[PDB]
Amino acid sequence: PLESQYQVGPLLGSGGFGSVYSGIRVSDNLPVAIKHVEKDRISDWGELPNGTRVPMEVVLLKKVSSGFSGVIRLLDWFERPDSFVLILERPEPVQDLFDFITERGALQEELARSFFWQVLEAVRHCHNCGVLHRDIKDENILIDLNRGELKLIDFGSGALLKDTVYTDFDGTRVYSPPEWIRYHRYHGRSAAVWSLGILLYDMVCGDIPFEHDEEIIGGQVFFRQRVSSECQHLIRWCLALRPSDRPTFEEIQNHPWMQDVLLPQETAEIHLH
Secondary structure (H helix, E strand, O other): OOOOOEEEEEEEEEEOOEEEEEEEEOOOOOEEEEEEEEHHHOOOEEEEOOOEEEEHHHHHHHHHOOOOOOEOOEEEEEEOOOEEEEEEEOOOOEEEHHHHHHHHOOOOHHHHHHHHHHHHHHHHHHHHOOEEOOOOOHHHEEEEOOOOEEEEOOOOOOEEOOOOOEOOOOOOHHHOOHHHHHHOOEOHHHHHHHHHHHHHHHHHHOOOOOOOHHHHHHOOOOOOOOOOHHHHHHHHHHOOOOHHHOOOHHHHHOOHHHOOOOOHHHHHHHHHO
16 A cells, blocks of 8 residues: 555655655654655656656666665655655654754854765765766755764756766756856766865855856855865865866865764764754
8 A cells, every 4th residue: 555554744845856744654663754746747757677667766766775875765666646656764853954054054164074075975875876866955965963964865856877968957056067057068977076066165154156157157266254275175176167177076085175074973973962
């Protein structure tokens, strides 16, 4: 059955992704999130090896849900006549990073460093599994407030990773790179890195660096908050206008600002508990 297995609780929210509810698995009381997507709202379709037309997000979530990681895992999914329903892990207690930054303002560099490292690890894991997320942003990251662990959500704008050009983008504009705004073309990794620079800026300044198309393609970064020279240098590198001037994940993680990261548990103790 569909909803004998899961006890549905309140609506967590809704939007372009569909509608997400809090829930419990009856057989063991595991916290779950239950996401409902209308078939008419799905542009990206895939198929499972067994031959079933599933949304691309299910295909992508299956590729990244083996083993432990900083991605929210797909536990199960159901097809209904007009919709699909995804059963996903749910940290408890949990707050999304957008909501967290709105509440606390700019994050201390120590906390931004831990958070940003964990996002890098999660994106690297996705990339190793053949998956490009394509909508990396604060609203798509959940913080397990007790464990200090960050978790990626929402692969509904994602794609299989390839080495050829993407001419489609359906993620968040203000996190979209200047080469997409100008040419409607990007490559996966270098665009991921740009969105990562938007995130890091967001973390340490408390808001995104660019509002309009024109500021994105001018790509000049003004700091409104006191930020360290090393942190400003990493941001500016991630947000280089030419894709080929951007760092690899390795170069980011080997950056001087990224040295001596707190563990998730220490992060929760110092900063979240």
